[PDB]
Amino acid sequence: EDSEVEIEILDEPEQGKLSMSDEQKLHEFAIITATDEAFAQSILQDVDWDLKKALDVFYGSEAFAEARSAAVMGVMTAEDLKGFEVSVMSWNIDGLDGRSLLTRMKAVAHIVKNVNPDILFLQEVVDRDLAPIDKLQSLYKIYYSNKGCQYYTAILVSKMFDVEKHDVIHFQNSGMYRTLQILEGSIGGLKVFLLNTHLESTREHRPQRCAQFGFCMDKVREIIAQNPGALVFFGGDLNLRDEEVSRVPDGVKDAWEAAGSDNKTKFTWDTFKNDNKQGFHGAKMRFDRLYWSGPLDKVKFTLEGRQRIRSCLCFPSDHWAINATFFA
Amino acid sequence: EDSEVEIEILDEPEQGKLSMSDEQKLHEFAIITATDEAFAQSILQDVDWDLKKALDVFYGSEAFAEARSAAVMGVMTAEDLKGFEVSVMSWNIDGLDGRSLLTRMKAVAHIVKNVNPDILFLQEVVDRDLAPIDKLQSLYKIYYSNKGCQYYTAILVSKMFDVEKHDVIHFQNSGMYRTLQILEGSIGGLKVFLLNTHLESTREHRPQRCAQFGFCMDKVREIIAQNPGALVFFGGDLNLRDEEVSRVPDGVKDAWEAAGSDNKTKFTWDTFKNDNKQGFHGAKMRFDRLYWSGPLDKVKFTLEGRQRIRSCLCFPSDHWAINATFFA
């Protein structure tokens, strides 16, 4: 009635066709799609030889975009990125500890200068005795998440890093002024996003922390979806226990894990080894972490700030710093 | 051995807990997530009360981003877009038909001026007798896909439309010079993408056409993923039979379908009604189509160019023009 009516081809066989074997199906798929039987094999051995499905998969499924491109057609760029490295360092410097704060901050600046990372995340930065950190502005552009607060986070980037924008999202479920600090910029023609945070502290605050984390991973997903080819770095002091870590988006990896999960570099807050804080029993955690996405696939991972300061016999922080170098 | 060691809370109950009923599970989920039992209900009645799963879903699943945002936090913009309308017209003007080409083109320009669309897609534009179409530059910015070819497509936009870029992708599987024409720009503060194409003609070329279509839908998916809040319009003469249409991405809708699937406006190439071409038997198809994505959810859909020209007794084209108005 209101169905479409097909054009007549006068010299065409006057009857269409209408079950099938397997090779029959491979040939059929090959003819319909104008692809080969070898490629037909692939799809046909994944949906239990459901041909009618396999067509819909080839044309409509998101997995086969590549194939479709190849069928129709026959930013960086591997060879530019080979020979490129970028280092990211993250450190909770425990500014809330007033004991030897100045000496410790000087130690921090010294260590940063020695390690010389391109990108640095700091947590627990306080206004008091901040001078030696501010002195780093000769090497870095410094961005504070929330100056005027008891404590806050910071992102320091090499001067080659062009900064497009600086955003701070205040977690409303946080009773500790915690934020997500986002720096958007670039290194040469490579777009880079930096996400620094200090998730809610202590085991009890698991519900707040786990909510913040998945929320941060949502933001990461958006950035990746909207900026293909971009380098995305997210992390800091996440205060995570291993069973708290929820599903991370595809293409996102933990730096310490991708470096080979070395036990020697696992724990970033170790009461057995760092005596800045003392309990009756030792405690140790991988609180500080770094995730990334982008066109760099290899990573080297070390800990820093592990040497006792000599003038005051303590460590720069109760945290070890994490240092990851990404390359291709 | 190399497991994390948890901090001791001295005044904490010295034994964790360890099966469950349903209300027990709702309460448990509520306490762990710091959410309510009413919300717990939702997730818990979707994974057959699989609590351990439901946690992973709440924190890690992409569906619950909203919830997570609400848990952590507590561009256009509805009220700006109410009162906003945009019209898109698509017409295969059959420039390859030399019969009364000039008179027909004048009719085309006249009809375009009468309908006055903000955006116009043209297919089968030829160099010969192009003058009255070029005259439209007083009202429109005109972009030709492939001038210097036997025939090509065009996109005409209102002068309020700011054009950021113009791309033409040549289909390599095409023996008919077919392309995907992409115009990226904006109307005020609203980003707009326009995708115009003339997919491979005739039923036989189904494999080429169906490949081109899914490929075009891949490009649409990318644009949507990378530009949230943007208006995306894709279509033209797609030469589609109904059973050829593969899965369209979420958020993409057929304009004629969203307008209510009116039989009165269904067929755009009707040999029973348009005698510019004559066969022994009539034929009719919905060859010409328009899909869209974006913050406009309502659409009105009409056909144009349905009146016989009086000086030469033919229609401007063997195609009817499609005209869709999008609003909120």
Side-chain angles (χ1 to χ4, degrees), chain A residues 235-273:
Chain A
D237 187 355
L238 311 186
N239 285 306
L240 291 164
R241 337 284 134 141
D242 274 354
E243 76 173 71
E244 283 172 344
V245 178
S246 46
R247 199 199 83 94
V248 325
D250 334 286
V252 176
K253 292 183 179 182
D254 188 318
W256 172 79
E257 293 188 344
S261 297
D262 194 348
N263 289 330
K264 282 171 296 171
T265 53
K266 186 173 185 180
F267 301 105
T268 67
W269 193 80
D270 194 348
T271 269
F272 298 94
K273 287 290 182 297

mmCIF file of all heavy atoms in Angstrom, chain A residues 235-273:
data_model
loop_
_atom_site.group_PDB
_atom_site.id
_atom_site.type_symbol
_atom_site.label_atom_id
_atom_site.label_comp_id
_atom_site.label_asym_id
_atom_site.label_seq_id
_atom_site.Cartn_x
_atom_site.Cartn_y
_atom_site.Cartn_z
ATOM 1 N N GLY A 235 45.698 11.832 38.771
ATOM 2 C CA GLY A 235 46.123 11.168 39.990
ATOM 3 C C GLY A 235 46.431 12.070 41.163
ATOM 4 O O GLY A 235 45.876 13.163 41.292
ATOM 5 N N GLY A 236 47.331 11.597 42.022
ATOM 6 C CA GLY A 236 47.699 12.306 43.234
ATOM 7 C C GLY A 236 47.575 11.404 44.447
ATOM 8 O O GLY A 236 47.807 10.193 44.357
ATOM 9 N N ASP A 237 47.216 11.996 45.583
ATOM 10 C CA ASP A 237 46.961 11.237 46.800
ATOM 11 C C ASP A 237 45.508 10.799 46.801
ATOM 12 O O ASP A 237 44.614 11.569 47.150
ATOM 13 C CB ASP A 237 47.259 12.076 48.043
ATOM 14 C CG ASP A 237 47.181 11.266 49.333
ATOM 15 O OD1 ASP A 237 46.801 10.074 49.282
ATOM 16 O OD2 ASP A 237 47.494 11.829 50.404
ATOM 17 N N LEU A 238 45.278 9.553 46.411
ATOM 18 C CA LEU A 238 43.922 9.069 46.226
ATOM 19 C C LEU A 238 43.422 8.302 47.443
ATOM 20 O O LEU A 238 42.252 7.935 47.508
ATOM 21 C CB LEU A 238 43.838 8.198 44.970
ATOM 22 C CG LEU A 238 44.465 8.823 43.715
ATOM 23 C CD1 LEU A 238 44.204 7.964 42.478
ATOM 24 C CD2 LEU A 238 43.954 10.240 43.511
ATOM 25 N N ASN A 239 44.319 8.067 48.400
ATOM 26 C CA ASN A 239 43.983 7.374 49.645
ATOM 27 C C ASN A 239 43.281 6.032 49.446
ATOM 28 O O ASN A 239 42.469 5.615 50.273
ATOM 29 C CB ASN A 239 43.148 8.278 50.560
ATOM 30 C CG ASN A 239 43.982 9.355 51.224
ATOM 31 O OD1 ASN A 239 44.986 9.064 51.877
ATOM 32 N ND2 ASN A 239 43.577 10.608 51.053
ATOM 33 N N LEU A 240 43.610 5.353 48.353
ATOM 34 C CA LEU A 240 42.904 4.133 47.969
ATOM 35 C C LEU A 240 43.457 2.868 48.612
ATOM 36 O O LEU A 240 44.671 2.678 48.699
ATOM 37 C CB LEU A 240 42.932 3.968 46.446
ATOM 38 C CG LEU A 240 42.121 4.957 45.606
ATOM 39 C CD1 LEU A 240 42.570 4.904 44.152
ATOM 40 C CD2 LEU A 240 40.635 4.664 45.722
ATOM 41 N N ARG A 241 42.551 2.007 49.063
ATOM 42 C CA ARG A 241 42.896 0.624 49.356
ATOM 43 C C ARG A 241 42.600 -0.142 48.070
ATOM 44 O O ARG A 241 41.738 0.269 47.294
ATOM 45 C CB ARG A 241 42.048 0.067 50.507
ATOM 46 C CG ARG A 241 41.469 1.116 51.444
ATOM 47 C CD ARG A 241 42.500 1.684 52.401
ATOM 48 N NE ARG A 241 42.418 3.143 52.471
ATOM 49 C CZ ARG A 241 42.562 3.855 53.585
ATOM 50 N NH1 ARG A 241 42.791 3.250 54.742
ATOM 51 N NH2 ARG A 241 42.479 5.179 53.537
ATOM 52 N N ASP A 242 43.300 -1.248 47.841
ATOM 53 C CA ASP A 242 43.176 -1.980 46.580
ATOM 54 C C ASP A 242 41.753 -2.406 46.204
ATOM 55 O O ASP A 242 41.396 -2.395 45.027
ATOM 56 C CB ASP A 242 44.107 -3.195 46.558
ATOM 57 C CG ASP A 242 45.505 -2.846 46.087
ATOM 58 O OD1 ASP A 242 45.725 -1.687 45.671
ATOM 59 O OD2 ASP A 242 46.380 -3.734 46.120
ATOM 60 N N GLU A 243 40.943 -2.768 47.192
ATOM 61 C CA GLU A 243 39.592 -3.239 46.902
ATOM 62 C C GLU A 243 38.607 -2.091 46.677
ATOM 63 O O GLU A 243 37.431 -2.319 46.397
ATOM 64 C CB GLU A 243 39.087 -4.187 47.995
ATOM 65 C CG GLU A 243 38.652 -3.511 49.280
ATOM 66 C CD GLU A 243 38.002 -4.487 50.249
ATOM 67 O OE1 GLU A 243 38.723 -5.336 50.818
ATOM 68 O OE2 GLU A 243 36.767 -4.409 50.438
ATOM 69 N N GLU A 244 39.097 -0.861 46.789
ATOM 70 C CA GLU A 244 38.263 0.316 46.560
ATOM 71 C C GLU A 244 38.259 0.735 45.094
ATOM 72 O O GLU A 244 37.346 1.425 44.641
ATOM 73 C CB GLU A 244 38.740 1.491 47.416
ATOM 74 C CG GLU A 244 38.350 1.412 48.877
ATOM 75 C CD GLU A 244 39.007 2.499 49.704
ATOM 76 O OE1 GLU A 244 39.987 3.103 49.216
ATOM 77 O OE2 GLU A 244 38.553 2.748 50.842
ATOM 78 N N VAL A 245 39.281 0.324 44.354
ATOM 79 C CA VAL A 245 39.427 0.766 42.976
ATOM 80 C C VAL A 245 38.376 0.156 42.060
ATOM 81 O O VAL A 245 38.342 -1.058 41.854
ATOM 82 C CB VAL A 245 40.826 0.457 42.425
ATOM 83 C CG1 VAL A 245 40.925 0.892 40.973
ATOM 84 C CG2 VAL A 245 41.885 1.149 43.275
ATOM 85 N N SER A 246 37.521 1.015 41.516
ATOM 86 C CA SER A 246 36.468 0.601 40.602
ATOM 87 C C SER A 246 36.988 0.519 39.169
ATOM 88 O O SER A 246 38.165 0.772 38.915
ATOM 89 C CB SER A 246 35.284 1.568 40.686
ATOM 90 O OG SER A 246 35.724 2.915 40.657
ATOM 91 N N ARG A 247 36.104 0.164 38.242
ATOM 92 C CA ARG A 247 36.481 -0.023 36.849
ATOM 93 C C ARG A 247 37.013 1.268 36.238
ATOM 94 O O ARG A 247 36.342 2.300 36.267
ATOM 95 C CB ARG A 247 35.281 -0.514 36.035
ATOM 96 C CG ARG A 247 35.649 -1.161 34.711
ATOM 97 C CD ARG A 247 34.461 -1.208 33.764
ATOM 98 N NE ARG A 247 34.281 0.057 33.054
ATOM 99 C CZ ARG A 247 34.790 0.321 31.854
ATOM 100 N NH1 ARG A 247 35.513 -0.594 31.222
ATOM 101 N NH2 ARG A 247 34.574 1.500 31.284
ATOM 102 N N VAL A 248 38.222 1.210 35.688
ATOM 103 C CA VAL A 248 38.766 2.349 34.956
ATOM 104 C C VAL A 248 38.420 2.226 33.468
ATOM 105 O O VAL A 248 38.368 1.120 32.924
ATOM 106 C CB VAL A 248 40.292 2.513 35.178
ATOM 107 C CG1 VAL A 248 40.652 2.118 36.598
ATOM 108 C CG2 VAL A 248 41.094 1.690 34.179
ATOM 109 N N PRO A 249 38.138 3.363 32.817
ATOM 110 C CA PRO A 249 37.777 3.394 31.392
ATOM 111 C C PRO A 249 38.843 2.786 30.483
ATOM 112 O O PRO A 249 40.026 2.828 30.816
ATOM 113 C CB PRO A 249 37.625 4.890 31.097
ATOM 114 C CG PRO A 249 38.238 5.602 32.261
ATOM 115 C CD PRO A 249 38.071 4.697 33.432
ATOM 116 N N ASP A 250 38.420 2.230 29.351
ATOM 117 C CA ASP A 250 39.343 1.628 28.391
ATOM 118 C C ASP A 250 40.368 2.651 27.929
ATOM 119 O O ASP A 250 40.033 3.808 27.679
ATOM 120 C CB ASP A 250 38.589 1.086 27.177
ATOM 121 C CG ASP A 250 37.155 0.717 27.494
ATOM 122 O OD1 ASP A 250 36.938 -0.319 28.160
ATOM 123 O OD2 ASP A 250 36.242 1.456 27.064
ATOM 124 N N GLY A 251 41.620 2.223 27.813
ATOM 125 C CA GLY A 251 42.685 3.119 27.407
ATOM 126 C C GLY A 251 43.319 3.840 28.584
ATOM 127 O O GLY A 251 44.267 4.600 28.416
ATOM 128 N N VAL A 252 42.796 3.611 29.782
ATOM 129 C CA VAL A 252 43.394 4.197 30.969
ATOM 130 C C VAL A 252 44.147 3.131 31.750
ATOM 131 O O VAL A 252 43.623 2.044 31.988
ATOM 132 C CB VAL A 252 42.331 4.858 31.870
ATOM 133 C CG1 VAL A 252 42.969 5.381 33.157
ATOM 134 C CG2 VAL A 252 41.626 5.970 31.112
ATOM 135 N N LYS A 253 45.380 3.436 32.134
ATOM 136 C CA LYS A 253 46.200 2.477 32.860
ATOM 137 C C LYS A 253 46.885 3.105 34.064
ATOM 138 O O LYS A 253 47.197 4.293 34.063
ATOM 139 C CB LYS A 253 47.257 1.864 31.937
ATOM 140 C CG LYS A 253 46.703 0.957 30.855
ATOM 141 C CD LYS A 253 47.825 0.345 30.042
ATOM 142 C CE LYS A 253 47.285 -0.577 28.969
ATOM 143 N NZ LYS A 253 48.382 -1.223 28.192
ATOM 144 N N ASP A 254 47.115 2.288 35.087
ATOM 145 C CA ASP A 254 47.864 2.688 36.272
ATOM 146 C C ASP A 254 49.347 2.635 35.930
ATOM 147 O O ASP A 254 49.844 1.607 35.460
ATOM 148 C CB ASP A 254 47.543 1.724 37.423
ATOM 149 C CG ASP A 254 48.135 2.162 38.757
ATOM 150 O OD1 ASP A 254 49.302 2.614 38.799
ATOM 151 O OD2 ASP A 254 47.422 2.045 39.778
ATOM 152 N N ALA A 255 50.050 3.739 36.178
ATOM 153 C CA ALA A 255 51.466 3.856 35.822
ATOM 154 C C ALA A 255 52.355 2.821 36.515
ATOM 155 O O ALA A 255 53.214 2.211 35.877
ATOM 156 C CB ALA A 255 51.969 5.269 36.099
ATOM 157 N N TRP A 256 52.138 2.614 37.813
ATOM 158 C CA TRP A 256 52.919 1.636 38.568
ATOM 159 C C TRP A 256 52.669 0.210 38.069
ATOM 160 O O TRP A 256 53.562 -0.641 38.099
ATOM 161 C CB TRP A 256 52.635 1.741 40.073
ATOM 162 C CG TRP A 256 53.266 0.640 40.860
ATOM 163 C CD1 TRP A 256 54.573 0.548 41.234
ATOM 164 C CD2 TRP A 256 52.623 -0.544 41.347
ATOM 165 N NE1 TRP A 256 54.786 -0.620 41.928
ATOM 166 C CE2 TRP A 256 53.606 -1.311 42.009
ATOM 167 C CE3 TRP A 256 51.315 -1.036 41.280
ATOM 168 C CZ2 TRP A 256 53.322 -2.534 42.611
ATOM 169 C CZ3 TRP A 256 51.032 -2.252 41.882
ATOM 170 C CH2 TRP A 256 52.033 -2.988 42.540
ATOM 171 N N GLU A 257 51.451 -0.043 37.607
ATOM 172 C CA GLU A 257 51.088 -1.359 37.105
ATOM 173 C C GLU A 257 51.687 -1.604 35.728
ATOM 174 O O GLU A 257 52.160 -2.704 35.427
ATOM 175 C CB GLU A 257 49.568 -1.518 37.062
ATOM 176 C CG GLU A 257 48.915 -1.528 38.431
ATOM 177 C CD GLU A 257 47.440 -1.885 38.373
ATOM 178 O OE1 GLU A 257 46.851 -1.820 37.273
ATOM 179 O OE2 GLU A 257 46.871 -2.236 39.429
ATOM 180 N N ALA A 258 51.675 -0.572 34.891
ATOM 181 C CA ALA A 258 52.193 -0.696 33.538
ATOM 182 C C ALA A 258 53.718 -0.767 33.536
ATOM 183 O O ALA A 258 54.323 -1.270 32.591
ATOM 184 C CB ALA A 258 51.703 0.457 32.672
ATOM 185 N N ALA A 259 54.333 -0.273 34.604
ATOM 186 C CA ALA A 259 55.783 -0.336 34.743
ATOM 187 C C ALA A 259 56.231 -1.722 35.198
ATOM 188 O O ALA A 259 57.424 -2.018 35.228
ATOM 189 C CB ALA A 259 56.268 0.723 35.707
ATOM 190 N N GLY A 260 55.268 -2.562 35.563
ATOM 191 C CA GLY A 260 55.556 -3.945 35.894
ATOM 192 C C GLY A 260 55.169 -4.377 37.297
ATOM 193 O O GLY A 260 55.515 -5.479 37.714
ATOM 194 N N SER A 261 54.452 -3.514 38.017
ATOM 195 C CA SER A 261 54.007 -3.806 39.384
ATOM 196 C C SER A 261 55.160 -4.216 40.301
ATOM 197 O O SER A 261 55.131 -5.282 40.915
ATOM 198 C CB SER A 261 52.918 -4.886 39.391
ATOM 199 O OG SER A 261 51.755 -4.454 38.707
ATOM 200 N N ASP A 262 56.175 -3.365 40.384
ATOM 201 C CA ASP A 262 57.356 -3.666 41.180
ATOM 202 C C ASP A 262 57.061 -3.472 42.661
ATOM 203 O O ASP A 262 56.661 -2.389 43.087
ATOM 204 C CB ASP A 262 58.519 -2.769 40.751
ATOM 205 C CG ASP A 262 59.855 -3.239 41.292
ATOM 206 O OD1 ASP A 262 59.880 -4.115 42.183
ATOM 207 O OD2 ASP A 262 60.890 -2.725 40.816
ATOM 208 N N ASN A 263 57.264 -4.532 43.439
ATOM 209 C CA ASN A 263 57.089 -4.476 44.885
ATOM 210 C C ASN A 263 58.005 -3.449 45.534
ATOM 211 O O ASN A 263 57.670 -2.873 46.567
ATOM 212 C CB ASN A 263 57.337 -5.848 45.510
ATOM 213 C CG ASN A 263 56.240 -6.845 45.183
ATOM 214 O OD1 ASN A 263 55.081 -6.471 44.992
ATOM 215 N ND2 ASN A 263 56.600 -8.124 45.127
ATOM 216 N N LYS A 264 59.158 -3.218 44.915
ATOM 217 C CA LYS A 264 60.125 -2.252 45.425
ATOM 218 C C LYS A 264 59.636 -0.806 45.336
ATOM 219 O O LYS A 264 60.160 0.071 46.018
ATOM 220 C CB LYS A 264 61.452 -2.389 44.682
ATOM 221 C CG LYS A 264 62.295 -3.566 45.126
ATOM 222 C CD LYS A 264 63.489 -3.762 44.201
ATOM 223 C CE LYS A 264 63.036 -4.116 42.786
ATOM 224 N NZ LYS A 264 64.156 -4.119 41.802
ATOM 225 N N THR A 265 58.638 -0.563 44.494
ATOM 226 C CA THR A 265 58.116 0.786 44.302
ATOM 227 C C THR A 265 56.620 0.863 44.588
ATOM 228 O O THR A 265 55.957 1.834 44.222
ATOM 229 C CB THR A 265 58.367 1.290 42.867
ATOM 230 O OG1 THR A 265 57.864 0.329 41.926
ATOM 231 C CG2 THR A 265 59.854 1.497 42.622
ATOM 232 N N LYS A 266 56.093 -0.162 45.245
ATOM 233 C CA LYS A 266 54.656 -0.271 45.460
ATOM 234 C C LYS A 266 54.106 0.753 46.456
ATOM 235 O O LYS A 266 53.228 1.546 46.123
ATOM 236 C CB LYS A 266 54.293 -1.687 45.913
ATOM 237 C CG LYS A 266 52.798 -1.929 46.028
ATOM 238 C CD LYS A 266 52.495 -3.380 46.322
ATOM 239 C CE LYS A 266 51.001 -3.638 46.304
ATOM 240 N NZ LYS A 266 50.694 -5.070 46.593
ATOM 241 N N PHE A 267 54.619 0.732 47.678
ATOM 242 C CA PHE A 267 54.023 1.524 48.740
ATOM 243 C C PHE A 267 54.573 2.947 48.823
ATOM 244 O O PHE A 267 55.784 3.161 48.834
ATOM 245 C CB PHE A 267 54.138 0.788 50.075
ATOM 246 C CG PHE A 267 53.470 -0.552 50.068
ATOM 247 C CD1 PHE A 267 54.217 -1.719 50.015
ATOM 248 C CD2 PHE A 267 52.088 -0.646 50.089
ATOM 249 C CE1 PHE A 267 53.594 -2.955 50.000
ATOM 250 C CE2 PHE A 267 51.462 -1.876 50.071
ATOM 251 C CZ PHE A 267 52.216 -3.035 50.030
ATOM 252 N N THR A 268 53.657 3.910 48.880
ATOM 253 C CA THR A 268 54.003 5.324 48.843
ATOM 254 C C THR A 268 53.825 5.982 50.208
ATOM 255 O O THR A 268 54.260 7.112 50.432
ATOM 256 C CB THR A 268 53.136 6.059 47.813
ATOM 257 O OG1 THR A 268 51.771 6.074 48.255
ATOM 258 C CG2 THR A 268 53.212 5.343 46.480
ATOM 259 N N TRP A 269 53.172 5.261 51.112
ATOM 260 C CA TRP A 269 52.974 5.714 52.481
ATOM 261 C C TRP A 269 53.277 4.530 53.389
ATOM 262 O O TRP A 269 52.425 3.673 53.606
ATOM 263 C CB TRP A 269 51.536 6.194 52.676
ATOM 264 C CG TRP A 269 51.303 6.963 53.941
ATOM 265 C CD1 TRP A 269 51.589 8.277 54.163
ATOM 266 C CD2 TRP A 269 50.710 6.472 55.150
ATOM 267 N NE1 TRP A 269 51.222 8.634 55.438
ATOM 268 C CE2 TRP A 269 50.681 7.543 56.066
ATOM 269 C CE3 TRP A 269 50.208 5.229 55.549
ATOM 270 C CZ2 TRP A 269 50.168 7.411 57.357
ATOM 271 C CZ3 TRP A 269 49.697 5.100 56.826
ATOM 272 C CH2 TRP A 269 49.683 6.184 57.717
ATOM 273 N N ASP A 270 54.507 4.477 53.892
ATOM 274 C CA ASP A 270 54.999 3.305 54.613
ATOM 275 C C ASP A 270 55.479 3.672 56.021
ATOM 276 O O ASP A 270 56.552 4.246 56.199
ATOM 277 C CB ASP A 270 56.133 2.650 53.816
ATOM 278 C CG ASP A 270 56.477 1.260 54.311
ATOM 279 O OD1 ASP A 270 56.008 0.874 55.403
ATOM 280 O OD2 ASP A 270 57.224 0.544 53.609
ATOM 281 N N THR A 271 54.679 3.320 57.018
ATOM 282 C CA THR A 271 54.993 3.622 58.412
ATOM 283 C C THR A 271 56.131 2.750 58.971
ATOM 284 O O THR A 271 56.833 3.146 59.906
ATOM 285 C CB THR A 271 53.701 3.568 59.265
ATOM 286 O OG1 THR A 271 53.121 4.877 59.293
ATOM 287 C CG2 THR A 271 53.959 3.099 60.684
ATOM 288 N N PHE A 272 56.338 1.584 58.363
ATOM 289 C CA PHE A 272 57.475 0.735 58.705
ATOM 290 C C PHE A 272 58.792 1.401 58.323
ATOM 291 O O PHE A 272 59.813 1.195 58.978
ATOM 292 C CB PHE A 272 57.393 -0.603 57.973
ATOM 293 C CG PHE A 272 56.194 -1.428 58.327
ATOM 294 C CD1 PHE A 272 55.043 -1.358 57.563
ATOM 295 C CD2 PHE A 272 56.225 -2.292 59.411
ATOM 296 C CE1 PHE A 272 53.939 -2.127 57.875
ATOM 297 C CE2 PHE A 272 55.125 -3.065 59.730
ATOM 298 C CZ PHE A 272 53.981 -2.981 58.962
ATOM 299 N N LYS A 273 58.765 2.189 57.252
ATOM 300 C CA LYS A 273 59.986 2.731 56.666
ATOM 301 C C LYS A 273 60.126 4.234 56.868
ATOM 302 O O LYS A 273 61.236 4.763 56.901
ATOM 303 C CB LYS A 273 60.038 2.402 55.172
ATOM 304 C CG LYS A 273 60.340 0.950 54.868
ATOM 305 C CD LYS A 273 61.774 0.622 55.233
ATOM 306 C CE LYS A 273 62.124 -0.815 54.885
ATOM 307 N NZ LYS A 273 61.304 -1.786 55.658
#
